[PDB]
Design a protein around this nucleic acid. Structure first.
Ligand SMILES: [Mg+2]
Ligand SMILES: [Zn+2]
Ligand SMILES: [Zn+2]
Ligand SMILES: [Zn+2]
Lengths: 89, 84, 113, 67, 113, 263, 49, 45, 147
RNA sequence: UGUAAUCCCCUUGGCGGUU
């Protein structure tokens, strides 16, 4: 619960002083690099590869043109060892 | 010594375009850094537009110091310089 | 690289209304209509149909930029007539004209088949 | 490289007339008469067949890379 | 909106000077902005930018325009300004410089416009 | 009030004369036939093997341009408007091509007749590549020599020519009015005499030439339009004309519905 | 055997027509990379002075 | 583990990252990798 | 001002469309009696200072295979150079960096399909690869034409 | 709970593009 605050105004101990946190107030994506297919929207049935997997918005590069597009997770079909699987991989 | 008295000021009484541009830039920066605004804002949000509105009403709290070649200077308030 | 998708010429986004109407207060009884995902095909048809109505005193349209698929139309009628009613009458009249044209073409094609 | 499917200007399908055009030229018909016999009226279409250079016959002379 | 969606932002800069990159941040929605911070937002419409063509023979070869974001990959000019720049559209290229401060933006919009 | 008079009729082109319509209506009809009548064309190519001398995307571009029979495309749905996961039989047609050269001599030509329809909507006459006759080999797609094989699977979708020119049913729509220039809509460039330096229009005999003593008529408007509609074979000429009219009607009806629902 | 081989190869590779240690004051640009953008460009390059 | 094709006789074989780079049957010094087994899709535009 | 208007439908039908090829070269250098470079798919554990691109498109031998779509900054050739090991052998379970990455990434502004991969030996008997990338360039606003 | 990565020569010469 100890915080080590340093301030340039304070000269003692080069501004370093210990103060408890209770006394202060404030001032691995398994589908990455996997082949995917789009099932809805304006890109239905296009094969791509997932590049960014921050969350709920996947960046998929398209094999058909030379471009990368965002897409929601619900719109993807992740390839597996047995056909195409929806977003439960 | 170097300062020139208000009675003997001989520079132009108008705001030159360089002074206008610098004053507007400085005021816009200050407003963007949460300085108090001296005019009522209707619906404006751009700091530059607020600065222009302040300038049109002669409410900018800045002073122009015009440097003569010999080193002496004249201090003109932006509220007493005529703006086109 | 920066080329937009071709389907954006005719596919309407959900948040974009197909047809936005705003009054033009500079002159009496005038409205400004903004058509989205449309071009000269509908605009010229509507304009030349409305230009023949005795109660329409000003009608015009323009496409602001060829790279954006929309056009804006200015309509201004007499005192008695609301402009939107005139627009509806124009649409219905052109529809009837196209219907009778289709019927006559079918008759002629069957005759000459 | 190989005869285009559609005429660039208008869009008439000219890709199915290359063999017939060569057959007609083989029989001694002139190029204008051969193009007329194929019902190519607009000169935009006529330039497609008239000025086509068949380069695939040169690419095919190289030994295939697989077997 | 993030650094890939227009309008968006690339960085958030705190008061102490630390830069928060929005590409590599997993909790971008969990960022609250305090007064005095800086957001390195994308270039938007009506932003003054300095525009230049070489060789710069006279002072009309550098002038400040207002940004309008458009598709495709070329800078676009009204044709009346092709005379001071000595430019035509047979392959010429021109340079664009973005001001990075309120003072500099005011200077561009009030002097070089 | 509008009238239609057909001059020549064929499966691939119709030459007709419109009258008692505005110029704007005829031009809108021409534009609609050119770029807003839905047809069926190959839109995805899955290349399982391609050892020919042509690039994969070269052959894909060539395939997309092959016209397919689009008679019953109205019953078909747009790909983006079909709720089915992936592609079903109600929003896509699957064609397959397999070509190979046997023997160590000679060259094999790959024609569009080799495109075989595998799946599609039930009992709908769509998807088959257009053939001039029963013995027409079709569009030349590629050439092969020994040990070169082409094995692809193509998917055809419904679209309009606004999105890509491969969905255009028409080739070139000749359009013409006022052969004798009575309306003075054009001013004729000339060196000596403008009358004998300009060729006569092909419809010049369909209208009486102006009398020598006739004055200009400022009350006249273009009234008779001569237009020829040529198709690529995916749709018949009458089908193209009727579907262009129907598409224009649908567009106007949509505008009317938007207006009525706005209030 | 390395002397002549390396000298010829260096002069043809870099275009400096002379010894490798006398690169300065030697006539440069004698040898150039063949332009293969199109057939006419190659033909023009092969007949240049 | 990965297939290869000779540049002269077009003979398929494989290498184990330790064999000399050479065709087994004609001794050519230039070999090519084989096409990937992934799906290749094009937009036909 | 020397611009021109082009027909979009003619462009769609293949007017002035072209094909673009670019080749990349790399080879294994010899620095000493037993210090050689190796074509391999480097791992995040045994190598240090990796490129920010993706290595998932490389095969077992460190070379991409033809027919694979590539984007900017992707790694098309995987190469590592040996480095004298540090004192990490203290308590690292074989997971200590012995090699440094020298991979070849695709150019940042370019993308396409891997067209053909060539593997052979140089004059010195070391491995030597060439990778050719293919893409199609369609005319668009700003492209230069001339009569 | 197994948790993913941040870095690039220099010199020279040639060939070009826009004026
Ligand atoms: Mg120029
Ligand atoms: Zn043509
Ligand atoms: Zn479906
Ligand atoms: Zn061999």
């Amino acid at each position: 619960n100890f915080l080590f605050l340093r301030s340039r105004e304070i000269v003692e101990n080069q501004g370093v002083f210990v103060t408890s946190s209770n006394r202060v107030k404030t001032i691995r994506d398994p589908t990455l690099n996997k082949t995917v297919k789009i099932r809805q929207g304006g890109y239905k049935g296009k094969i791509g590869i997932v590049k960014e997997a921050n969350g709920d918005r996947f960046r998929v590069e398209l094999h058909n043109p030379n471009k990368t597009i965002p897409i929601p997770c619900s719109f993807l079909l992740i390839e597996s060892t047995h056909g195409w699987v929806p977003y439960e991989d | 010594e170097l300062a020139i008295l208000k009675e003997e000021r001989t520079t132009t009484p108008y705001l030159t375009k360089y002074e206008r541009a610098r004053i507007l830039g400085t005021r816009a920066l200050q407003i963007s850094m949460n300085a108090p605004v001296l005019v009522d804002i209707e619906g404006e949000t751009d700091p530059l537009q607020i600065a222009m509105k302040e300038l049109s009403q002669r409410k900018i709290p800045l002073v122009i110091r015009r440097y003569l070649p010999d080193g002496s200077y004249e201090d003109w308030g932006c509220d007493e310089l005529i703006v086109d | 690289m920066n080329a937009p998708d071709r389907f954006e010429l005719f596919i309407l986004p959900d948040d974009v209304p197909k047809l936005k109407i705003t009054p033009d207060s500079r002159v009496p009884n005038c409205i400004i209509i903004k058509f989205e995902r449309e071009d000269h095909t509908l605009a010229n048809l509507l304009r030349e149909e409305l230009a023949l109505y005795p109660d329409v005193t000003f009608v015009a349209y323009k496409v602001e930029h060829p790279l954006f698929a929309n056009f804006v139309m200015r309509l201004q009628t007499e005192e008695g007539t609301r402009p939107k009613q005139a627009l509806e009458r124009a649409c219905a009249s052109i529809i009837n004209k196209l219907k009778t044209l289709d019927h006559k073409f079918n008759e002629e094609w069957n005759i000459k088949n | 490289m190989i005869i285009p499917v559609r005429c660039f200007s208008c869009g008439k399908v000219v890709g199915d007339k290359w063999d017939a055009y060569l057959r007609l030229l083989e029989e001694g018909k002139q190029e204008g008469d051969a193009l007329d016999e194929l019902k190519l009226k607009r000169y935009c279409c006529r330039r497609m067949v008239l000025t086509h250079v068949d380069l695939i016959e040169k690419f095919l002379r190289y030994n295939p890379l697989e077997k | 909106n993030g650094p890939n969606e227009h309008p968006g932002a690339k960085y958030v800069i705190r008061d102490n000077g630390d830069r928060i990159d929005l590409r590599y941040h997993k909790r971008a929605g969990d960022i609250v902005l305090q007064y005095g911070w800086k957001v390195e937002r994308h270039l938007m419409d009506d932003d003054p930018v300095l525009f230049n063509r070489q060789p710069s023979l006279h002072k009309m070869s550098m002038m400040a325009h207002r940004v309008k974001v458009m598709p495709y990959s070329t800078f676009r000019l009204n044709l009346s300004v092709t005379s001071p720049y000595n430019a035509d559209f047979d392959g010429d290229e021109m340079n664009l410089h973005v001001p990075q401060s309120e003072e500099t933006r005011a200077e561009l919009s009030q002097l070089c416009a | 009030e509008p009238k239609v008079n057909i001059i020549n009729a064929q499966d691939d082109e119709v030459e007709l004369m419109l009258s008692d319509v505005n110029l704007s209506l005829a031009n809108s009809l021409r534009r609609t036939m050119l770029a807003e009548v839905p047809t069926l064309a190959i839109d995805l190519v899955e290349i399982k093997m391609n050892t020919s001398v042509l690039a994969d995307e070269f052959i894909s571009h060539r395939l997309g341009l092959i016209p397919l029979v689009s008679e019953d495309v109205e019953e078909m749905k747009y790909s983006r408007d079909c709720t089915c996961e992936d592609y079903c039989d109600e929003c896509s047609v699957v064609l397959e091509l397999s070509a190979r050269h046997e023997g160590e001599e000679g060259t094999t030509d790959v024609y569009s007749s080799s495109l075989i329809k595998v799946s599609g909507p039930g009992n709908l006459n769509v998807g088959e590549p257009v053939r001039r006759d029963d013995y027409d080999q079709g569009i030349l797609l590629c050439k092969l020599r020994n040990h070169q094989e082409l094995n692809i699977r193509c998917i055809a979708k419904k679209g309009i020519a606004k999105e890509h020119a491969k969905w255009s049913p028409c080739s070139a729509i000749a359009f013409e009015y006022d052969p004798h220039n009575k309306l003075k809509h054009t001013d004729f460039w000339f060196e000596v005499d403008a009358k004998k330096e300009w060729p006569d229009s092909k419809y010049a005999t369909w209208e009486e030439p102006p009398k020598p003593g006739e004055v200009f008529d400022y009350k006249a408007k273009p009234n008779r339009f001569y237009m020829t509609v040529e198709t690529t074979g995916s749709l018949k000429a009458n089908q193209v004309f009727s579907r262009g009219i129907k598409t224009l009607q649908e567009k106007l009806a949509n505008v009317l519905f938007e207006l009525e629902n706005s209030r | 055997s390395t002397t002549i081989t390396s000298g010829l190869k260096y002069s043809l590779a870099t275009g400096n027509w002379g010894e490798q240690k006398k690169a300065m004051s030697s006539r440069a640009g004698v040898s150039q990379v063949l332009n293969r953008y199109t057939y006419s460009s190659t033909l023009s390059h092969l007949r240049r002075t | 583990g990965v297939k290869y094709t000779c540049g002269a006789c077009a003979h398929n074989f494989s290498l184990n990252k330790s064999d000399p780079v050479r065709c087994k049957e004609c001794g050519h010094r230039v070999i090519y990798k084989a096409r990937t087994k992934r799906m290749i899709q094009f937009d036909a535009r | 001002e020397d611009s021109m208007i082009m027909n979009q439908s003619s462009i769609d039908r293949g007017l002035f469309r072209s094909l673009f090829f670019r080749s990349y070269m790399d080879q294994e250098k010899r620095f000493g009696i037993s210090i050689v470079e190796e074509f391999e798919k480097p791992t995040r554990a045994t190598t240090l200072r990796l490129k920010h691109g993706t290595y998932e498109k490389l095969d077992e031998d460190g070379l991409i295979a033809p027919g694979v779509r590539v984007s900017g900054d992707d790694i098309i050739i995987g190469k590592t150079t040996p480095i004298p090991p540090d004192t990490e052998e203290l308590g690292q379970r074989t997971k200590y960096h012995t090699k440094r990455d020298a991979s070849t990434p695709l150019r940042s502004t370019e993308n396409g399909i891997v067209d053909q991969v060539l593997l052979t030996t140089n004059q010195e008997g070391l491995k030597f690869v060439k990778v050719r990338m293919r893409t199609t360039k369609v005319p668009q606003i700003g492209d230069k034409f001339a009569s």
